[PDB]
Amino acid sequence: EFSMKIGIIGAMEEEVTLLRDKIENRQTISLGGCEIYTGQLNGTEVALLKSGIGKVAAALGATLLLEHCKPDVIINTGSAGGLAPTLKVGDIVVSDEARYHDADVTAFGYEYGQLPGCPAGFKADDKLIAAAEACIAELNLNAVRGLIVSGDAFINGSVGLAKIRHNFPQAIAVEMEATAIAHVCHNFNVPFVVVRAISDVADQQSHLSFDEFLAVAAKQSSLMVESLVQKLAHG
Amino acid sequence: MKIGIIGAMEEEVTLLRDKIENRQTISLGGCEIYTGQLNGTEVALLKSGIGKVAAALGATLLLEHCKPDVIINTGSAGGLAPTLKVGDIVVSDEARYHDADVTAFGYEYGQLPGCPAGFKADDKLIAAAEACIAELNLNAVRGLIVSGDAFINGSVGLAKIRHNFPQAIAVEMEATAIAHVCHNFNVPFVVVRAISDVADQQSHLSFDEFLAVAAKQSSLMVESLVQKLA
Numbered sequence: 001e002f003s004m005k006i007g008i009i010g011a012m013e014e015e016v017t018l019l020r021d022k023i024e025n026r027q028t029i030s031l032g033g034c035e036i037y038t039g040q041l042n043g044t045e046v047a048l049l050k051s052g053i054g055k056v057a058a059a060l061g062a063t064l065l066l067e068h069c070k071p072d073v074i075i076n077t078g079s080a081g082g083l084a085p086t087l088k089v090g091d092i093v094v095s096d097e098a099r100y101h102d103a104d105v106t107a108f109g110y111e112y113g114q115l116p117g118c119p120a121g122f123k124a125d126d127k128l129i130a131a132a133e134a135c136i137a138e139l140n141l142n143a144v145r146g147l148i149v150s151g152d153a154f155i156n157g158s159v160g161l162a163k164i165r166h167n168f169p170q171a172i173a174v175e176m177e178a179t180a181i182a183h184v185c186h187n188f189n190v191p192f193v194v195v196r197a198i199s200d201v202a203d204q205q206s207h208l209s210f211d212e213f214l215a216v217a218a219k220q221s222s223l224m225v226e227s228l229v230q231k232l233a234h235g
Numbered sequence: 236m237k238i239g240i241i242g243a244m245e246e247e248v249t250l251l252r253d254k255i256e257n258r259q260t261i262s263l264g265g266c267e268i269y270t271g272q273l274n275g276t277e278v279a280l281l282k283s284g285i286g287k288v289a290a291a292l293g294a295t296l297l298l299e300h301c302k303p304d305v306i307i308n309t310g311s312a313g314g315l316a317p318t319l320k321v322g323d324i325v326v327s328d329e330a331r332y333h334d335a336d337v338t339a340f341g342y343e344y345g346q347l348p349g350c351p352a353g354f355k356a357d358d359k360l361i362a363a364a365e366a367c368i369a370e371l372n373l374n375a376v377r378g379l380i381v382s383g384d385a386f387i388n389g390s391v392g393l394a395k396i397r398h399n400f401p402q403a404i405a406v407e408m409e410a411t412a413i414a415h416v417c418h419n420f421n422v423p424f425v426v427v428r429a430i431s432d433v434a435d436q437q438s439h440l441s442f443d444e445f446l447a448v449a450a451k452q453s454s455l456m457v458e459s460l461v462q463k464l465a
């Protein structure tokens with residue numbers, strides 16, 4: 001305790017800003033097109049990286065963060081399109097696993113979503129998940145735990161969504177960085193957990209919904225992250 | 236100067252690895268990096284995994300740890316240009332994701348926010364590559380190479396690529412990711428790959444059958460380019 005460094009990766013300005021503004025003794029390190037904010041969040045040493053959007057940007061960011069700040073665990077936050085029926089805009093999704101919904105080397109006998117040399121899915125850390133569920137209960141928020149899928153496409157209904165629902169009937173949310181981050185953490189053997197807030201249900205109106213509720217998603221994911229850091233650091 | 240080289244599969248990396256002298260191996264984030272000299276030239280060879288995230292992670296590591304001057308991404312590819320046959324070379328003048336789609340927000344198809352719609356390869360590296368192609372009498376095509384996390388083997392996947400990028404000369408799985416990373420660091424790059432298949436319904440069989448040829452041809456080309464640059 002007291003010597004834990006918690007890594008946090010968010011892709012977009014909005015939520016990252018709220019967390020960034022709350023960092024004490026904040027400093028900014030700009031690298032490979034990424035900004036990394038170091039300091040403490042309510043006492044806990046954190047390293048917050050604003051990655052770009054997409055798998056590669058997230059991978060590049062996650063790799064840089066691991067390499068230069070060597071955080072003990074990684075928390076990926078931000079928005080996501082809710083897929084589980086009980087999810088409403090603002091609700092929380094916690095990954096117990098992450099899979100690429102757009103990876104496909106099945107022609108070679110790999111499981112759909114699986115890339116060669118990688119497990120079909122990347123498992124989030126049990127302690128981190130439990131911690132997150134603890135915060136969820138304590139904050140009295142509605143949330144769902146389960147499989148989160150990533151791809152380099154903003155899902156907006158039509159075939160994008162149906163294909164995902166068909167390939168991963170159990171997926172609770174879809175977004176664009178989670179699995180890339182999980183993938184990099186897996187390779188570095190670093191525990192991770194994805195804690196995002198719903199900004200849309202990835203249907204025909206996901207773009208306007210995203211546009212109108214990105215703010216609330218940022219508010220709720222940031223609140224959860226702040227709460228998770230605290231709980232991970234103490235109790 | 237130091238030439239960075241990234242290949243996804245052991246096949247297209249092993250022949251080069253065997254030729255590197257003053258050889259040392261750095262093993263990080265599940266990636267292997269061999270440094271030393273290829274026929275007198277300082278290089279840094281990285282075996283990345285397959286797919287964009289693995290490539291990005293590896294490219295990021297190579298840049299960060301070895302600081303090469305330029306990056307050469309090598310390996311196999313599915314040929315899309317009519318002139319391409321197994322064993323032939325494709326040289327990128329540009330790389331684009333064929334599976335990135337945020338057009339819902341007004342970005343160009345294949346384009347990811349914060350990035351140009353396409354990443355342009357270095358003109359010098361391109362000219363160098365083509366001088367080798369000419370000197371070795373190889374059949375090659377220069378143009379747009381598109382990358383995604385799916386092995387293309389006809390059907391809907393190939394159709395989607397034809398739709399969005401009818402001018403793409405080849406499809407593979409790491410190029411644009413390496414380009415994207417090189418872009419964030421301002422490192423010139425060039426993709427030089429050999430055709431292992433034509434991304435049709437028979438690409439899996441062709442890939443298995445010709446991956447060996449593709450690796451040797453891409454390997455020979457990297458060797459020649461390295462020497463030409465130096």
Ligand SMILES: Nc1ncnc2c([C@@H]3O[C@H](CO)[C@@H](O)[C@H]3O)n[nH]c12
Pocket residue numbers: 011012053054078079080081153154155156174175176177199200201202203206210337
């Ligand atoms: N329905 C949806 N489809 C894809 N990505 C998202 C997102 C997230 O918001 C960004 C959209 O480009 C990206 O970082 C992604 O992780 N929210 N809702 C989404």
Ligand SMILES: Nc1ncnc2c([C@@H]3O[C@H](CO)[C@@H](O)[C@H]3O)n[nH]c12
Pocket residue numbers: 105243244285286310311312313385386387388406407408409410431432433434435438442
């Ligand atoms: N028809 C095709 N579709 C997608 N990738 C490839 C490739 C390349 O070979 C590997 C196939 O999984 C990968 O490294 C990729 O970059 N060759 N032919 C391909």
